Glucose-1-phosphate thymidylyltransferase
Amino acid sequence: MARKGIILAGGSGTRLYPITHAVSKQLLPVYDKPMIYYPLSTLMIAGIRDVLIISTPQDTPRFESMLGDGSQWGMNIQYATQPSPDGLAQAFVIGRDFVGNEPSALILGDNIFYGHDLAKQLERASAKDTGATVFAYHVQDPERYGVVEFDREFRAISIEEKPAKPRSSYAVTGLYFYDRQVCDIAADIKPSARGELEITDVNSRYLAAGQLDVELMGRGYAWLDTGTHDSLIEAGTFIATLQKRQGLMVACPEEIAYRRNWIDAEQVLKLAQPLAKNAYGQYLRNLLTHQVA
Amino acid sequence: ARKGIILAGGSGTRLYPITHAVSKQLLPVYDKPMIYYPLSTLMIAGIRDVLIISTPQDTPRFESMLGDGSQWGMNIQYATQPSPDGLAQAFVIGRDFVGNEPSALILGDNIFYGHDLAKQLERASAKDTGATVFAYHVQDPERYGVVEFDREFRAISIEEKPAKPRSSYAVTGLYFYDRQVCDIAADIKPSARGELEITDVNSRYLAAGQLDVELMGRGYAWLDTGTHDSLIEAGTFIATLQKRQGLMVACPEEIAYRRNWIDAEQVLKLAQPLAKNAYGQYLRNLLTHQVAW
Amino acid sequence: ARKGIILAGGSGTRLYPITHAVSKQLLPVYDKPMIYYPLSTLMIAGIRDVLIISTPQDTPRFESMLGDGSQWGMNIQYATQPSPDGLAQAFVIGRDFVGNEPSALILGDNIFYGHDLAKQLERASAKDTGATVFAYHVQDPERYGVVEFDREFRAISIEEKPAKPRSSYAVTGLYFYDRQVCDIAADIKPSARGELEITDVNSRYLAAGQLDVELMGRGYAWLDTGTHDSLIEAGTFIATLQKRQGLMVACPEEIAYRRNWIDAEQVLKLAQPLAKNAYGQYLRNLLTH
Amino acid sequence: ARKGIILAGGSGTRLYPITHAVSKQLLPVYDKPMIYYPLSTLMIAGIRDVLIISTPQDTPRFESMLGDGSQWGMNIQYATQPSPDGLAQAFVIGRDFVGNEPSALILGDNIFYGHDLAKQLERASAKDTGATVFAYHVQDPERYGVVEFDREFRAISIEEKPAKPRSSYAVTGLYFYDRQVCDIAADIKPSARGELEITDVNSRYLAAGQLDVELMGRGYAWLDTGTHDSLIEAGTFIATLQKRQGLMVACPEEIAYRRNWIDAEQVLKLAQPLAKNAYGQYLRNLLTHQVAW
Ligand SMILES: Cc1cn([C@H]2C[C@H](O)[C@@H](COP(=O)(O)OP(=O)(O)O[C@H]3O[C@@H](C)[C@H](O)[C@@H](O)[C@H]3O)O2)c(=O)[nH]c1=O
Ligand SMILES: Cc1cn([C@H]2C[C@H](O)[C@@H](COP(=O)(O)OP(=O)(O)O[C@H]3O[C@@H](C)[C@H](O)[C@@H](O)[C@H]3O)O2)c(=O)[nH]c1=O
Ligand SMILES: Cc1cn([C@H]2C[C@H](O)[C@@H](COP(=O)(O)OP(=O)(O)O[C@H]3O[C@@H](C)[C@H](O)[C@@H](O)[C@H]3O)O2)c(=O)[nH]c1=O
Ligand SMILES: Cc1cn([C@H]2C[C@H](O)[C@@H](COP(=O)(O)OP(=O)(O)O[C@H]3O[C@@H](C)[C@H](O)[C@@H](O)[C@H]3O)O2)c(=O)[nH]c1=O
Ligand SMILES: O=c1ccn([C@H]2C[C@H](O)[C@@H](COP(=O)(O)O)O2)c(=O)[nH]1
Ligand SMILES: O=c1ccn([C@H]2C[C@H](O)[C@@H](COP(=O)(O)O)O2)c(=O)[nH]1
Ligand SMILES: O=c1ccn([C@H]2C[C@H](O)[C@@H](COP(=O)(O)O)O2)c(=O)[nH]1
Ligand SMILES: O=c1ccn([C@H]2C[C@H](O)[C@@H](COP(=O)(O)O)O2)c(=O)[nH]1
């Protein structure tokens, strides 16, 4: 099974003006790499090799100049455009031909996922052939998101988009795994009062059918988005603290692709050669000697 | 029941002058004293009997902060180390406290954080013979006890601050031992740097084929606080998670409550003197807010 | 011969539990205890006689940290405040220490930093009569004494914690007084919030036409540490400056040395027990840099 | 009528990959693009005519970010530098722009902050003959032009990146020049490193007795952003001030408004499309604010 991945990295509004005035939010740094490296690496760790990047028409060339066609990482990366940010579920209209008759995953281009055993959880979700998987995460401001209502046993009862009175602090994260039904469901839902095709309508539909796994993503994980200037810089210092302590890089696509044998040592060296003087290139070269289990 | 020791003794003048009057483990890591973090790690391991070892002058300062632990359904006792003459002294000083039980040692300035930590601590705690240490990939392994690995799994050596570290895996400040450790610690002699070495304890188990090295993956944060910079970074790391989640790292009242070591009545009694501040409100919210555990 | 007071007493439980065992003003701001900063501010103002007021339980810890100040060519004395009953109580407790000299009060948790701070402190210390306070634009002025200005920006009134602040300018925690202040502090009565208010002291000088309210511009950092967030933010702020410059903010040995209160031999005696750490190396570099 | 040049050209690949995507000087420093900071420094010195020099690839990106400056009552023009062949090249590329007027050069990645900065820039800006540079005590002076001082602490020479620095005082990335500078730059010859050195430009003024070297005290922040660490630290530095004060560092609308380059009506036209975000709110409060003398 070849699950097809979608990174939605389109228009993010003007909350961060003026740092997003010229530059797309998802090309801005989180410490030492562009933001979009993080959700890209999350898909790679889930085993996904076919990725569609959806951005605004104005910014697609900027993303393409950054990531290419993915062949440098043994991946296939393609591009499509979203003229206005008219809903997350619109990804499954724009990306319908890319998805084909395959399972898929959607991730937001500004969402950072980090924590121990993340790969096992993403691999279990990626491997299921029917139904859907989303993740629930305790946050300070749940009213910003789709919010999960849980019974005493943490069985999911409902999902509401931006409720006035959140039923819990558990938000639906910006990562979704779907079987082959999702594109047709996306054709059946209707734009909401805020004028958007709602991923929450997709998700509540799977929940009503008894086909939604709502997985708790515990407090040991970091699920960060970067909605304010404070939380953007906080995500950067968070990554820096881990990397400097460990001598390991978070979300290095060459590392992940090499460890999964999507690229070999020769290809790692070819990527490192123009970067030999800087820290990223030296990190790539050090992959060929290093031992990590 | 496994008995825990927090070694919170003298740290020298490395951090002068912030440690001139006050012990390091009473200093803040963001919003709570440092020692709350290793204490909470022992509690997460299921350990309820804890010995605090500090300098004689600082014992009252720690006792005023933690008491006898009965407020958290624990038993906390105190012993002294006049001079920081080696980690293995925890099992000489703590010999009567350990008695004939299994034990664990944790450093008072070590912060462990990450998803599923409890499962790993419980697995180590469940061993009935041998010892368990945790290996963590760091930038500068020569600062620590270093694990050497063969091509496969096994750890084949541990070396204290080697000139040529045989790997990047540092032995963390958390150790689990069977009933042999107190006699082993009485049998070894101080090293060339004049200290009773936990590495020499661990090498005794290794030579007997009784040392398990549990890998602590890059998804975990293992932070210590050896410099002014790393001390303040540990604070900003905690702050990023807590501001994101609305959850507290290392709240002993929370952990004891969720484990049913204390009930809702006791939580309320602890919240009563703090009613106005954020910590008291956090304690109150434990009884009303739904949090998965 | 102005005499200084550092008010480093009970700060309540807002920062609980980091202040449960240890007093706020002994906690680190990056690489040194908080109280080093306001102490160094007094030193930069030229003040060599300092009274530290803390709770009864914490004076030994402050005394262990600073001693009698003779190591820096200063005189540091200690007094206690049983309950935190108002900033103006500093001049009741410290009345005998002040004597009939001019004085200055600074809060033990206030950090002042910026270019030409010394010149501004020297002008205030040089006033013969009256008082000087500093006004600083802040995000949350309602937490403080707030300055009301007339149309031409003269200070005309001050109110403690106003419901609707009349400006964004707070009175900082640094105050200069002539010989009137101790008798003024004995005359005021506790306010509705039950405290002897420094705003009442300052209002009396202002009502008499004897208060200079000096604007402290946005180029200065005036930091207190009222939240866990602002405590750590002050630390990263100091760290960025020090790591960039290779210079230390608020090193008392440095300040006493550059002011010739101690000589090169005294610096070396202070550095010798600190030889292994970075602070001792900084002291040694004072003689070479 | 002094004319300003912001040198914001090729920065190399030390910051790869965050500069693969975006030009360095468009990267965020907390809540605004890096280039806002040096732009505002020129504005505080009273300079209204600014030349931005960048790479050919990056000039369009700066243009979309800043326009022609008429929105701030300024005149902003653009020129290109195909190769980063030396700071002194700004006065070759920008020779026509300067004409026969005095000028100033600032680095596009340099942040200046501190009390009375305006008074010092105004003094430098008014000097009819000669040039003015700034000396600043730094940890690592060998990275820069280093000032040599005599016993009387008067400047004797400037060495570019000496192996053995004669002081800790570096020349900051801000320079004021008379009408000699454009001819002097065409006169100089490339150094052992194929670059036209501003240090050589400055030496000519010094040898002629026409260089003022002003000490910039430890109360000022002079920051550059040469590493991932120093880039993010510059952001946290700004954030601490702004959150404490409720004032923004380097808001060009604010500086231009207070200098009467634009009027209240113009500020409102700028705020209107930004009404929902924090920056627009800040512009609106300028018309109601009490912040003056
Ligand atoms: C709506 C939308 C957003 N985006 C981008 C902008 C942001 O970087 C990112 C999210 O934008 P928002 O306005 O916050 O989307 P949003 O308001 O729909 O937030 C979503 O957040 C998820 C985490 C929850 O699971 C959802 O239930 C929902 O709450 O996606 C697009 O590119 N296209 C779009 O159509
Ligand atoms: C030596 C010692 C330290 N300490 C405190 C001081 C610090 O807070 C903390 C660590 O002190 P150090 O000098 O760094 O110890 P250390 O130099 O012995 O380091 C140890 O570090 C562990 C992480 C490794 O697993 C060990 O193998 C070893 O490297 O423990 C005591 O309380 N008592 C002592 O006897
Ligand atoms: C009241 C009081 C405080 N303190 C300490 C506690 C804090 O560290 C510090 C300030 O305490 P607070 O309760 O915040 O004080 P406060 O509530 O009086 O705040 C003061 O702040 C100044 C900056 C203003 O200029 C004053 O006008 C006033 O607003 O002083 C004492 O040591 N003793 C006391 O009696
Ligand atoms: C050389 C050069 C740099 N730049 C950019 C790249 C950086 O963002 C910035 C500085 O470039 P560097 O390689 O560091 O140049 P540099 O090595 O000349 O550093 C300079 O630093 C100044 C602060 C000192 O006053 C000078 O004396 C000098 O030391 O300017 C250009 O745009 N064009 C150029 O030709
Ligand atoms: O009340 C609690 C529960 C957990 N943890 C810490 C222990 C581990 O570091 C991590 C557990 O994360 P999960 O296993 O819930 O994802 O959080 C706390 O500090 N307090
Ligand atoms: O090359 C890699 C491997 C893992 N991770 C991330 C994915 C998860 O967030 C975490 C995995 O940690 P462990 O499960 O190995 O502890 O690190 C990377 O960024 N790059
Ligand atoms: O030894 C010293 C000298 C100065 N400063 C502080 C006081 C002011 O905040 C600032 C003075 O800056 P300048 O006036 O020297 O630029 O530095 C110190 O902390 N220690
Ligand atoms: O609108 C303004 C005014 C000043 N400053 C900066 C320039 C100096 O770095 C400092 C001036 O502080 P004072 O000179 O007002 O103290 O603030 C700005 O960024 N924007």
